[PDB]
């Protein structure tokens, strides 16, 4: 039996202003975080917004490292504004015997997204 | 036999469980559970859940951690008590996947609760 | 790579009275019905709401064959009533080699829930 | 490597594509898309598809159906057809899961779309 996993978390982020156009549907996430998190690009998220309780899912895309951007993108801008507090998570699926023991990876912030 | 149609099915869930506490202060986005509970229901820690709140009618999905055997605690945290507060009768279930032949047989595992979130 | 198949569905049913008392979050369905469309007791569905446009997911259990019963069991009552029309589907996953000539089950209405 | 975690990745989009139709009266359930597009977003018929509506923010999945190659349709079908109007601006996006290292060097398959549904 295959379980659903928590993979990573960015646990409490801030939604930023986008430094760059990125394509709506999209959340563009400092390369930074998405490294500490273990989330990569493409990869389908959730966020969870902890300001408004609003929940959607949409998919992850680098920003340049540094930039701390937590840029949600198009449709998405419908659900968080720059200022909100966030999770954004990702889940993997594996068998039974291996979730049993699964640690997923968090990032923790402090201040203007500067991980802990 | 390699190819096969895999399922999604009820795995196991807590029926009708009270949320005991709601905080939006950091915890932030899941939902802690009395690991007897947990045994129960077959539910993993960092395993994804789906909260069907019977008293209010939203439905959410996040994951689940461990409370303390014995502590009784449903604790909804961050952004998730923005959609149960302390008092409200919620579902909790996790879905597993297999393929078929396995998914016509399955049984999935519950737990049922009355009063003081004593379990059935 | 695994594609999510729809496996099957009921096209148009009306949402009905339940016969029996059902446990909350669920929605029961005539075995007939599960039968034409390889829906599985316990298994996730997915439940669009033709009437009012509402979409929720649950589980499916089995009413009674003949019973033609459509209920929307408890929390999952916020979503439905009696009268209203939906479309219940399930989905699988598959590789994508399989997935290109898939085809799902599915069942058709006329009446009051009488299958064509 | 049995047991390896597996990851959900966008396999395809047609990003902001137009919605042409879009009827309550059952083709019900799916959204009906031009066989053209599907091959290039690599989209099958009766795959399961999220459509993210940029004009009025509503989110909803679904599962995609082929309509005439060369017809430019996106049809937004039944139930469908209340979170979706013609003339709307959307994204249809099909996920797949693969393996870890797979997923670290997957490319999704994307089609961009200008004035008479035209994919560029």
Known sequence: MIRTMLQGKLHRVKVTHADLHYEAGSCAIDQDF??????????????????????????????????????????????ASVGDIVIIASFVTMPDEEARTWRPNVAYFEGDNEMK
Not at 37 to 47: C, F, K, R
Not at 49 to 76: L, Q
């Open 34 to 79: 998405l490294d500490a998190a273990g989330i990569l690009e493409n990869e389908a998220i959730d966020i969870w917004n902890v300001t408004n309780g609003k929940r959607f899912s949409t998919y992850a895309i680098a920003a340049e490292r540094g930039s701390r951007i937590i840029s949600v993108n198009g449709a998405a801008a419908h659900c």
